[PDB]
Amino acid sequence: PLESQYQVGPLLGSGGFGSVYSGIRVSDNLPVAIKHVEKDRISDWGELPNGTRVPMEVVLLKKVSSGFSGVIRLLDWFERPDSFVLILERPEPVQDLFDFITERGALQEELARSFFWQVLEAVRHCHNCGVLHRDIKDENILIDLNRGELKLIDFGSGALLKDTVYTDFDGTRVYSPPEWIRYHRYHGRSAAVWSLGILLYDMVCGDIPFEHDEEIIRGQVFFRQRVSSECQHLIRWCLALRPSDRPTFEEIQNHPWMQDVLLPQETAEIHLH
Numbered sequence: 001p002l003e004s005q006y007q008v009g010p011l012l013g014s015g016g017f018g019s020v021y022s023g024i025r026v027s028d029n030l031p032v033a034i035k036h037v038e039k040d041r042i043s044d045w046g047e048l049p050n051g052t053r054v055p056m057e058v059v060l061l062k063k064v065s066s067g068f069s070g071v072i073r074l075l076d077w078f079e080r081p082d083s084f085v086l087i088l089e090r091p092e093p094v095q096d097l098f099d100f101i102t103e104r105g106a107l108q109e110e111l112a113r114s115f116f117w118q119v120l121e122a123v124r125h126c127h128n129c130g131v132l133h134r135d136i137k138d139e140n141i142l143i144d145l146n147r148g149e150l151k152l153i154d155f156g157s158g159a160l161l162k163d164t165v166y167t168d169f170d171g172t173r174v175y176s177p178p179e180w181i182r183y184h185r186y187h188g189r190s191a192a193v194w195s196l197g198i199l200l201y202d203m204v205c206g207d208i209p210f211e212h213d214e215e216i217i218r219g220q221v222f223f224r225q226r227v228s229s230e231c232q233h234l235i236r237w238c239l240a241l242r243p244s245d246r247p248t249f250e251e252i253q254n255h256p257w258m259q260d261v262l263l264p265q266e267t268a269e270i271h272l273h
């Protein structure tokens with residue numbers, strides 16, 4: 001079933017998420033990504049409308065799937081005795097934001113604005129679809145280098161969006177909010193805004209602002225690179241200690257630093273080509 005449909009290429013990466021290979025769909029030569037995840041390594045299980053027991057990740061990807069290119073598209077999935085295999089769309093050429101920032105260092109603010117805006121549109125879409133990502137970070141963002149379009153990947157730490165408190169977390173600790181560190185409690189949207197503040201800092205400074213738990217709890221932001229006052233203000237707002245002091249997504253996108261965003265194509269032409 002999987003063998004007669006897909007042609008497996010080289011390993012793209014492996015980690016907590018599992019193992020992801022490059023691939024081609026034989027029928028139409030479509031570039032794909034083949035993700036393998038061990039059953040033992042999945043703690044978060046979900047159910048389809050069919051009543052079928054699948055990883056939460058599959059549930060969440062189906063819930064976010066549409067013509068919108070800001071989230072990775074799940075094309076197909078398969079169950080093996082000891083693993084689940086996910087077929088994902090693969091943009092070509094592509095590079096993850098972590099690698100991109102590593103190569104460029106700190107991003108120009110115009111470029112950071114375009115990237116951050118697109119991330120915001122992607123996250124808002126997820127929330128509007130009842131999906132919380134819980135792992136927003138540079139490594140989980142792909143850049144379509146031709147089109148200047150960004151894509152959220154890896155919903156393996158995600159959950160159904162709810163208005164009540166989360167007492168579980170499996171994403172990246174250095175992106176997690178002080179209320180998680182201190183109390184093991186957080187709410188979806190406000191935790192997501194914190195991680196977005198970490199991400200934005202990372203874009204404009206070339207690195208994350210905090211490494212240790214004590215740094216997260218203190219939440220004192222030091223800028224190691226030249227960053228405009230407007231951007232600094234937005235970052236500090238997203239990184240407010242009290243979750244209710246953090247901006248809503250609307251407030252972020254209405255912020256003066258976020259005005260006059262480039263289109264993705266304009267972004268690629270100026271910054272990527």
Ligand SMILES: Cc1nc2cccc3c2nc1N[C@H](C)/C=C\C[C@H]1CNC(=O)c2cc-3[nH]c21
Nearest residue numbers: 012013017020033088089090091094096153154
């Ligand atoms: C180059 C590349 N293309 C991709 C296309 C579709 C989906 C993924 C993807 N990943 C890469 N490269 C990255 C660096 C490799 C592993 C990261 C891994 C992280 N978790 C995922 O679910 C996922 C999806 C893709 N990649 C991942």
